[PDB]
Amino acid sequence: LSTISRALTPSPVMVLENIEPEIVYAGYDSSKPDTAENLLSTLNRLAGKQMIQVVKWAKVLPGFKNLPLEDQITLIQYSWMSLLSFALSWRSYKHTNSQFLYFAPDLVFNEEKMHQSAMYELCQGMHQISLQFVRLQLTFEEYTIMKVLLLLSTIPKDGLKSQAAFEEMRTNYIKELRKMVTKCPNNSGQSWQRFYQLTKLLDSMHDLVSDLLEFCFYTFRESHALKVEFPAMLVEIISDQLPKVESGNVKPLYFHRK
Ligand SMILES: O=C1COc2ccc(C3=C(c4ccc(F)cc4F)C(=O)OC3)cc2N1
């Protein structure tokens, strides 16, 4: 809080990079075949543990604490699949140059796994998002800021408890992205073009993530019949999220209008 301390303290993007979650293992069971039942159960277990890290992350995310508890909860529950998908795309980009879907070091999907998981087309759509990371040569700086924008990209139909505090936080992070692209237009030429590409990429997540969620809601509802395991963390999120999304109580915020 000191004057000197404030002027010198790591910038907001440096803070985001510092609080980026550690590596999470899926705990892949080599004794089980790669069937939908086992792959999806493994993805769900993995995602539960990643979501625990996401909550820890959100806890020290600057600005997030300034929202009401219920809005914080609401935002994590609405954006969870966007956050996991984006982080997946990043890992896939960094570890495999977006050739494969790197869910964890012990769970990397090639095309065969994509089929086996019963979400071939969804995995291919995500892989295609990851290919954009290669085209753009997305940077760690862009990634971290964009991930925050994803946390802040889906809200209830009639908005949040503290809509103004949310909008302030969202604007603040959009501004960080603006600053970043002004400094570093990277391979898009002009800073405005960089911002356009990055925000279009974010908008392009919505339909894929919505499709991912529909499958997740289906397997959740039919969990016992399908033998698809969900951990408590996902049970909690999906039990709250599913009726809201399915009843239209959901509003995606697009950077660019349809
Ligand atoms: O039971 C089900 C079926 O619907 C699901 C849909 C998605 C997931 C998760 C993803 C994921 C994200 C992007 C993709 F392209 C493929 C993905 F699998 C992730 O990264 O974490 C969980 C898990 C289930 N679980």
UniProtKB/Swiss-Prot annotation:
Effect of mutating C123S: Strongly decreases affinity for aldosterone and transcription transactivation
Record annotation: effect of changing E246G: In PHA1A; reduces affinity for aldosterone and transcription transactivation
Subcellular location: Cytoplasm; Nucleus; Endoplasmic reticulum membrane
Consequence when changing F230A: Abolishes aldosterone binding and transcription transactivation
Effect ascribed to mutating R91A: Reduces aldosterone binding and transcription transactivation
Chain residues that bind progesterone: N44, Q50, R91, T219
Effect of L253P: In PHA1A; loss of aldosterone binding and transcription transactivation
Effect of Q50A: Reduces aldosterone binding and transcription transactivation
Region named Important for coactivator binding: 56-59
Family the entry assigns: Belongs to the nuclear hormone receptor family. NR3 subfamily.
Name of the molecule in the record: Mineralocorticoid receptor
Gene behind this protein: NR3C2
